[PDB]
Design a protein around this ligand. Structure first.
Ligand code: 44P
Length: 542
């Protein structure tokens, strides 16, 4: 059992199982034992079986904390959202002081739009980051009202834990001579944000920057998307799913990558330990983790003048590089299809449709309140949202009612295949952004379909992304100072269709004319920046 933990700790789940099972062989029905078995299952990804057992073991010892949290982990990944929440609750009841349970609880509550004791929970996670302690996940922490400084703190602490338990590969340099090898590590190469944002760029680079060798290190297998196949077509895609961290790192070294981009990085399925092994001489943070890595192994972050302005530099560990337009490319080959009718989409046939298709953890009391206030001031408006996990949708219905709006004014879109979800935007009149974690991919999606995005650019990179897209498009009037200006601008537009029509017209002009959706230009800018970076590190060219 002690043995079994070490065996499980090591990775040998089968030997782990064998040990545990002999443990149970002694006292059948025992909490401490029954739980480890369920943890084997969880590790083995037999997630429904993990939860049966941890429920047996939880029920026999309603008081171990310990076991409660582990049952949460298992119920989370088994898609039993509300029950996983109820388990983290208990684990928090038993140990209110442990800023490792609180962090997992808070995050799971944001994702279910459960806001009980939110501020008290957030404070305790922020306290934990200020001493950290250290538990706290930098991705989850993005959802909090913390400053750039606090996110950095959270990220270092997490980075230090990794850098301590890893020995870097032998240092190497950028080749002085020959075509530059450029590498990108992601689990999202396919029908995922990363694949979706980068695909038209890679095809543009393949055509326009022949002196750069693109390499994609995919930490996920083929999902059968046209994205994965296009990405494969436009580069050398290496499937490294199932290689451990070190073998992944060695495989990047084997290919002699000069510049290596981390697309995810604190992400969730991200392999930051691969970066921690420094397989490439220059390592860049870009695009799909909207914050600092906080990490000694990351040389650079790639941003832009708006989303990462001079006043944000003190709060990055990386050195800051900027593109000449927005940091964010997108799939400009996408023909947005026509949606079903409004009725077929749950929408009324008349009425202004305000929408926000953001992830549930981005929808907080502040972002919701201000969307709801727009609805109160605009008679026949409707609010169109992504349907969310567990009972998320019902909690927002109750909150709308509490905020003095008819709950039936909220329409919840089920998750759709990307081409179908994209088409939904043609029914939307205005996209209402979230704070402090902006719409990112979803804002690019919205604008590409022709739907304007209203945002309140904040003080962190993650609260400035929507506003960068507006800024680089020329839509400055859609970046407003605060909640009051937000509700006012939206109300102004929603209650005057002629101005609204003019705005859609304006977005169409600016869509075609600005550099924002010009992936050829993006490729030339990106490539030139890569080349100039490489010469700064001794590349002589060719
Ligand atoms: O019904 C849907 C809903 C969402 N998306 C896609 O879900 C993704 C946005 O999800 P994220 O919040 O994890 C990524 P971000 O925070 O970096 O912006 C995009 O790929 C959307 O096109 C769909 O394709 N269909």
């Amino acid at each position: 059992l002690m043995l079994a933990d070490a065996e499980l700790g090591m990775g040998d789940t089968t030997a782990g199982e064998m040990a545990v099972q002999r443990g149970l062989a002694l006292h059948p029905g025992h909490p401490e034992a029954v739980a480890r078995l369920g943890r084997v299952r969880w590790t083995q990804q037999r997630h429904a079986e993990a939860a049966v057992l941890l429920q047996q073991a939880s029920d026999a010892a309603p008081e171990h904390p310990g076991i409660a949290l582990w049952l949460g982990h298992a119920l989370e990944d088994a898609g039993q959202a509300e029950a996983a929440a109820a388990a983290y609750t208990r684990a928090h009841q038993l140990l209110p002081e442990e800023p490792y349970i609180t962090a997992q609880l808070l995050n799971w509550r944001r994702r279910l739009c459960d806001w009980r004791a939110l501020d008290v929970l957030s404070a305790q996670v922020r306290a934990a980051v200020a001493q950290g302690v250290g538990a706290v996940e930098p991705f989850a922490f993005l959802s909090e009202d913390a400053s750039a400084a606090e996110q950095l703190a959270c990220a270092r602490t997490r980075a230090q834990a990794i850098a301590a338990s890893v020995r870097p590969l032998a240092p190497t340099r950028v080749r002085s001579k020959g075509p530059l090898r450029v590498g990108f590590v992601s689990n999202g190469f396919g029908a995922h944000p990363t694949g979706l944002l980068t695909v038209a760029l890679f095809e543009a680079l393949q055509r326009r920057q022949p002196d750069l060798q693109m390499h994609l290190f995919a930490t996920s297998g083929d999902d059968g998307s046209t994205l994965r196949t296009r990405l494969a077509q436009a580069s050398t895609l290496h499937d490294v799913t199932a290689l451990g961290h070190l073998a992944t790192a060695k495989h990047i070294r084997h290919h002699g990558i000069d510049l290596l981009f981390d697309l995810r990085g604190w992400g969730g399925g991200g392999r930051p330990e691969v970066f921690a092994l420094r397989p490439a001489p220059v390592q860049v943070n870009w695009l799909a983790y909207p914050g600092t890595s906080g990490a000694p192994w990351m040389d650079y972050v790639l941003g832009d003048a708006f989303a990462l302005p001079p006043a944000l530099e003190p709060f990055y560990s990386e050195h800051v590089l900027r593109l000449q337009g927005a940091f964010q490319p997108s799939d400009t080959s996408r023909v947005v299809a026509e949606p079903p009718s409004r009725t077929q989409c749950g929408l009324p046939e008349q009425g202004v449709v305000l929408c926000c298709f953001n992830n549930s953890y981005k929808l907080n009391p502040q972002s919701m309140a201000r969307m709801l206030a727009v609805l109160r001031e605009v008679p026949d408006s409707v609010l169109w949202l992504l349907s969310g996990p567990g009972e998320a949708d019902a909690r927002l219905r109750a909150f709308a009612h509490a905020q003095g709006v008819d709950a039936q004014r909220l329409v919840f879109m089920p998750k759709l295949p990307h081409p179908q979800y994209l088409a939904r935007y043609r029914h939307a009149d205005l996209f209402l952004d979230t704070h402090p974690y902006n719409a990112h991919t979803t804002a690019s999606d919205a604008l590409w379909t022709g739907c304007p995005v209203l945002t309140t650019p904040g003080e962190t990179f993650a609260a400035r992304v929507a506003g960068s897209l507006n800024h680089h498009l020329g839509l400055d009037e859609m970046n407003v100072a605060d909640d009051a200006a937000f509700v006012a601008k939206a109300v102004a537009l929603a209650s005057d269709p002629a101005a609204l029509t003019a705005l859609h017209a304006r977005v169409d002009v600016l869509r075609r004319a600005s550099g924002v959706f010009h992936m050829d230009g993006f490729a030339d800018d990106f490539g030139a920046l890569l080349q100039a970076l490489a010469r700064r590190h001794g590349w002589l060219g060719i």
